[PDB]
């Protein structure tokens, strides 16, 4: 699964996109596996976290602070992320401007990566991309 080669074009696309302000603090949600099959979410997630940090064009909420904010908020430590309402709560607690969703959907062999950038203040999705993912 060449995550990186799917994600780099998408992150860039997102950066170029109308309504996305760079240098924003970004609560980065775990990549949701909604394929018909199974894959490692964590390999995908880390690559994505990695992609958004290179080249310092987004600040990310650290996973520790995230877990801390859940304790604060009374939520389960590794149930990341809750609903839109839950993630908003967390985002606002930490100082986050966007929350970034991502999912691998469709065919577990040859899946599509889907990202949505939600604006925390309005709950409004202000960008989305879809990308093919290809070994």
User: In this structure, what CATH number is given to the domain that contains residue 11?
Assistant: 3.40.50.10610
As a whole number of angstroms, the distance between CA 80 and CA 86 comes to 10
How many structural domains is the chain composed of?
1
As a whole number of angstroms, the distance between CA 128 and CA 19 comes to 11
Solved by what technique? X-ray
Q: Which class for 15: exposed (0-12), middle (13-18), buried (19 or more C-beta within 10 A)?
A: middle
Q: Residue 123: left if φ>0, alpha if ψ -120 to 50, beta else—which one?
A: left
State whether residue 112 is helix, strand or coil.
Answer: strand
**For residue 60, what are the domain limits?**
1-135
H or E stretch at 41 = helix 41-53
Contact indicator for 48, 133 with CB cutoff of 8 Å: no
Q: Which class for 34: exposed (0-12), middle (13-18), buried (19 or more C-beta within 10 A)?
A: exposed
Q: Which class for 107: exposed (0-12), middle (13-18), buried (19 or more C-beta within 10 A)?
A: exposed
């Amino acid at each position: 699964y060449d995550w990186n080669g799917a994600m780099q074009p998408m992150v860039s696309k997102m950066l170029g996109a109308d309504g996305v302000t760079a240098g924003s603090v970004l609560l980065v949600d775990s990549v949701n596996n909604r394929t018909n099959g199974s894959l490692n979410a964590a390999e995908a997630t880390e690559t994505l976290r990695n992609a958004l940090a290179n080249n310092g064009k987004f600040t990310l909420v650290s996973a520790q602070q995230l877990s801390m904010a859940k304790q604060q908020l009374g939520l389960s430590p590794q149930d990341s992320l809750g609903t839109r309402s839950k993630a908003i709560g967390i985002a606002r607690n930490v100082g986050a401007h966007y929350v970034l969703y991502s999912s691998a959907s469709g065919n577990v062999n040859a899946p599509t990566l889907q990202m949505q950038l939600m604006l925390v203040q309005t709950g409004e999705i202000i960008w989305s991309g879809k990308g093919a993912v290809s070994q």
